[PDB]
Amino acid sequence: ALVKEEIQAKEYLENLNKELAKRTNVETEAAWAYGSNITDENEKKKNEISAELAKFMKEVASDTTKFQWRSYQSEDLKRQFKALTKLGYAALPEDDYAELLDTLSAMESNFAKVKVCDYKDSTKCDLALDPEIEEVISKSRDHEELAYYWREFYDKAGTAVRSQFERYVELNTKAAKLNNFTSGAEAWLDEYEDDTFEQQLEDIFADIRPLYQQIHGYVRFRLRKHYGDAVVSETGPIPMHLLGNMWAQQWSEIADIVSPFPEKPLVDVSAEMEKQGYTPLKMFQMGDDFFTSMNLTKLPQDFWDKSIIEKPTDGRDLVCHASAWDFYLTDDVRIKQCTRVTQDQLFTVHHELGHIQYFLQYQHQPFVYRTGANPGFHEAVGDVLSLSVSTPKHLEKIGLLKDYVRDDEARINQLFLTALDKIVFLPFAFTMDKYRWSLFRGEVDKANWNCAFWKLRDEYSGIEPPVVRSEKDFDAPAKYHISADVEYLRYLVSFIIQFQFYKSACIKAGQYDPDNVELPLDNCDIYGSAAAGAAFHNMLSMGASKPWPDALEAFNGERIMSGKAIAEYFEPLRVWLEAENIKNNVHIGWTTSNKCVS
Numbered sequence: 001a002l003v004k005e006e007i008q009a010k011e012y013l014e015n016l017n018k019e020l021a022k023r024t025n026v027e028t029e030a031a032w033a034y035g036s037n038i039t040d041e042n043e044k045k046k047n048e049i050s051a052e053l054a055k056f057m058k059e060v061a062s063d064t065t066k067f068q069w070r071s072y073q074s075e076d077l078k079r080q081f082k083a084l085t086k087l088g089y090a091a092l093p094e095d096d097y098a099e100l101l102d103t104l105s106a107m108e109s110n111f112a113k114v115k116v117c118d119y120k121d122s123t124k125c126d127l128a129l130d131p132e133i134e135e136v137i138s139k140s141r142d143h144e145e146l147a148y149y150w151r152e153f154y155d156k157a158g159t160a161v162r163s164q165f166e167r168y169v170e171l172n173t174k175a176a177k178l179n180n181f182t183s184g185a186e187a188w189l190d191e192y193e194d195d196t197f198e199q200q201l202e203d204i205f206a207d208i209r210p211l212y213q214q215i216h217g218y219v220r221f222r223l224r225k226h227y228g229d230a231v232v233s234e235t236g237p238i239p240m241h242l243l244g245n246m247w248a249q250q251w252s253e254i255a256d257i258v259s260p261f262p263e264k265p266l267v268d269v270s271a272e273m274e275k276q277g278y279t280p281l282k283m284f285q286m287g288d289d290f291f292t293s294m295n296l297t298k299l300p301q302d303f304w305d306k307s308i309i310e311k312p313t314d315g316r317d318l319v320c321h322a323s324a325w326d327f328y329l330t331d332d333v334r335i336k337q338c339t340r341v342t343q344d345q346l347f348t349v350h351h352e353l354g355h356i357q358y359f360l361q362y363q364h365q366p367f368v369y370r371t372g373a374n375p376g377f378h379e380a381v382g383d384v385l386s387l388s389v390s391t392p393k394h395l396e397k398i399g400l401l402k403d404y405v406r407d408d409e410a411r412i413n414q415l416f417l418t419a420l421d422k423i424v425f426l427p428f429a430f431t432m433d434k435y436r437w438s439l440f441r442g443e444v445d446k447a448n449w450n451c452a453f454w455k456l457r458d459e460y461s462g463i464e465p466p467v468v469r470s471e472k473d474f475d476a477p478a479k480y481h482i483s484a485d486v487e488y489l490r491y492l493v494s495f496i497i498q499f500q501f502y503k504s505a506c507i508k509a510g511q512y513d514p515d516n517v518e519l520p521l522d523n524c525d526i527y528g529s530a531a532a533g534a535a536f537h538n539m540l541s542m543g544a545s546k547p548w549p550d551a552l553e554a555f556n557g558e559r560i561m562s563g564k565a566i567a568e569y570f571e572p573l574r575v576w577l578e579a580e581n582i583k584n585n586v587h588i589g590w591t592t593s594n595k596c597v598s
């Protein structure tokens, strides 16, 4: 009978979940050791343990066919069994899996080991992305210096890894088809449990796109006044090396030269952080404080004992790209961040601690449910708090922002500053996966792979390389997530839903009322709010036990991903900017880039 089997299945799942958590702990430890300390020995260990876990997953997927799980009464049991059937890369033959693992570590270690020569000292060749190159890209206003570092980095992080990336695409595709997905695109999209997810995002993006075009146009206009028309054209895509970020994904680093009102305050607390003696430890302690103030979970002792919150001073290679780690026991959670004392980094700390909080909130769940409601949910958590810490309201409380008058002009400055991160990012994030999906789906011939990347960056973001590129270059893997095989759509989802979360948290905190001029959404601080924290607890504790619309519903009663909230936040900016662009006869839109030779 199926009655007796469903009882046995429940016992089978309880044991297997515990076994999976314990086996994944071992894998995670090896992966942590490698990311903290890149050596051939640690690479070998990381990959061999992963191969062992993959072999066990195969046996598990095989064992699920012994249970008539699709016939069960319990939605919960069926959801767990379905999670176990999804093998991903572990579906590959033993040898193919080992090759993929070797290919993935080759790309990630290449990225992490990139060193360039000083622009002004051809003998000093130990400059790493974090912190040396990123410091220049964010600070220098010498367009030739910027172009030098752009070219050096993309050549070493991107082009060097073309052949490995090609084999990765091949094996990612083979794995997807062994799971009976059309391609790795569909394998990734499966995480959102919604067959209309792509269309939904297209629809949301199309609504926000006009505002992006206005921001793009205004930024280009302001850059022309700074660099001259020899460097920046009125009608062409913006040369990307001028945007304060290696990938032009966020433009907040050039706010000082593109801010709407330069005679009025622009929030940049990095200087005051240094003046007050801020350390990486203090930054993480302050993040911890924010979470506990909302009646959420305090960081466990293991976190403080085991985390790496400063770049090691020895000679060693490591992955500095900030990350948060769940070890699948109790309270063993960690961050590895090469923390610097800057405003941007203070947000990064809060982002990473958002992941940590999610880990702690769902650690009581069965193993298969110990992940986000969807990948976008995991990315949104910390950003919701960062939206609060970024407000003049909060920064004044912690004494990082002094003598600030919040008039109409200062408000536009702050809204614009926020948009340089939040709106600008949306087409960037969409293109990262639009590009990879098109390769996964076999829609682009190998001979056209590089210009296919730059074509998307042009079409969606209106940016282009500083120098002419061709199919002799391969620039995509110059972005961490592309070398590290990390799905990117999670961030596009996050940047939309984080405003749904923020708006609701602010309403719950009594910090936002659309009919009260004293409580605007863009100055909401949810610090100390138990009510906002309660909504987070309700949602985060669920993990992946229910489809994501149920997790959203637990937060604010809503079930639909919507661009209403983000548009509501930036509405005052939209009104001002549209008028300002008309006032200054600002050209909107761009001609097709000439910077990738087919």
Ligand SMILES: *[C@@H]1O[C@H](CO)[C@@H](O[C@@H]2O[C@H](CO)[C@@H](O[C@@H]3O[C@H](CO[C@H]4O[C@H](CO)[C@@H](O)[C@H](O)[C@@H]4O)[C@@H](O)[C@H](O[C@H]4O[C@H](CO[C@@H]5O[C@H](CO)[C@@H](O)[C@H](O)[C@@H]5O)[C@@H](O)[C@H](O)[C@@H]4O)[C@@H]3O)[C@H](O)[C@H]2NC(C)=O)[C@H](O)[C@H]1NC(C)=O
Binding pocket: 178, 179, 180
């Ligand atoms: C991705 O899609 C793939 C299809 O494109 C799919 O591959 C198929 O998986 C099937 C397993 O679900 C498998 O079906 C079996 O076929 C056996 C004979 O296959 C031969 O001929 C094929 C030609 O079509 C060849 O391709 C093969 O190489 C073989 O030479 C059958 O022997 C087998 O049967 C047994 O199992 C069924 C179980 O079904 C249930 O059983 C319960 C009992 O507990 C019943 O209550 C229930 O009603 C139901 O019947 C028994 O019924 C039966 O008595 C036998 O014991 C089975 O039909 C198929 O071969 C395989 N390939 C192809 C090409 O079809 C992958 O599994 C998919 N991958 C993922 C990850 O989902």
Ligand SMILES: NCCCC[C@H](N[C@@H](CCc1ccccc1)C(=O)O)C(=O)N[C@H](Cc1c[nH]c2ccccc12)C(=O)O
Binding pocket: 249, 321, 322, 323, 324, 347, 348, 351, 352, 355, 379, 383, 486, 491
């Ligand atoms: N200087 C900013 C660093 C932000 C670190 C983060 N890192 C990722 C790590 C992803 C990962 C996956 C698998 C194995 C190891 C690591 C994260 O924690 O989400 C990330 O990739 N972040 C951003 C995208 C981003 C979303 N929200 C943010 C809030 C602030 C800043 C950036 C972001 C990026 O594209 O760089």
Ligand SMILES: *[C@@H]1O[C@H](CO)[C@@H](O)[C@H](O)[C@H]1NC(C)=O
Binding pocket: 037, 039, 040, 041, 042, 314, 316
């Ligand atoms: C880094 O790893 C090597 C071996 O791969 C090990 O001998 C060494 O102790 C590690 N270094 C540090 C600083 O932990």
Ligand SMILES: *[C@@H]1O[C@H](CO)[C@@H](O)[C@H](O)[C@H]1NC(C)=O
Binding pocket: 295, 530, 531, 537
């Ligand atoms: C703190 O959270 C607990 C449960 O996590 C809850 O019972 C308690 O009411 C919360 N405190 C406040 C002040 O709401």
Ligand SMILES: [Zn+2]
Binding pocket: 351, 352, 355, 378, 379
């Ligand atoms: Zn993240």
